[PDB]
Amino acid sequence: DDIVVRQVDVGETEQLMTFLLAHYYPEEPLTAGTHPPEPEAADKEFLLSNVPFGTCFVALHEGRIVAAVVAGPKDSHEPEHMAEEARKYAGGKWGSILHLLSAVETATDVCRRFSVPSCLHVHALGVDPQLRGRNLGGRLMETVAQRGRDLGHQLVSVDCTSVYSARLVQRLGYQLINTLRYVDHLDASGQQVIRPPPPHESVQTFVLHL
């Protein structure tokens, strides 16, 4: 009962972004696997654009941000939205990232695949490792799931990109529905789009029925 979980507000995002640049971006494989090794602005701005939905949360320890989750609702039009954004942004850092993410959205296409009108998709989960024992990640994921039930959303999805994230969602009972290996993902030229360092090998999308 030592940790405060609250919804991020449109007003208070600078600190959220400050946290993410500290405890999410650096280790993130899509970000590390593209060679301008610093997140572009369109990237950060797409993360923050989810806030107005009231679907982003932080965990506060003594009023400092200790963990954050970024999530937003999506529908059957996401594959088109993603394909369009990927065309818009080729071929810069964010374009490469979208290229892969669009391929995933296109392949998973969860609204149509599970006959559901909308999914709550988790875009980013970041945790300050200096607080082991606090179950920060689980609490926030449990929080987006509940927020999703309030909203009447019937699904949550998450494209797991590390081991931590996969184990976390596996133990909250998500089901694995797609696996895309970075080495298997080439561009129109046949060139590998995302090349993250060891030990990252694949994007694994998980879903939870609410």
Residue numbers in the entry: 7 to 216
Sentences from the paper on this structure:
The findings presented in this manuscript highlight mechanistic and structural insights for D. melanogaster AgmNAT, an enzyme that catalyzes the formation of N-acetylagmatine from acetyl-CoA and agmatine. AgmNAT is a member of the GCN5-related N-acetyltransferase family (GNAT)2 and, in addition to the formation of N-acetylagmatine, this enzyme also catalyzes the production of N-acylpolyamines from the corresponding acyl-CoA and polyamine. As observed for arcaine, arginine methyl ester produced uncompetitive and competitive inhibition plots for acetyl-CoA and agmatine. These data demonstrate that AgmNAT catalyzes the formation of N-acetylagmatine through an ordered sequential mechanism: acetyl-CoA binding first followed by agmatine to generate the AgmNAT•acetyl-CoA•agmatine complex prior to catalysis. After the ternary complex formation, Glu-34 functions as the general base to deprotonate the positively charged amine moiety of agmatine, most likely involving a “proton wire” of ordered water molecules, followed by nucleophilic attack of the carbonyl of the acetyl-CoA thioester to generate a zwitterionic tetrahedral intermediate.
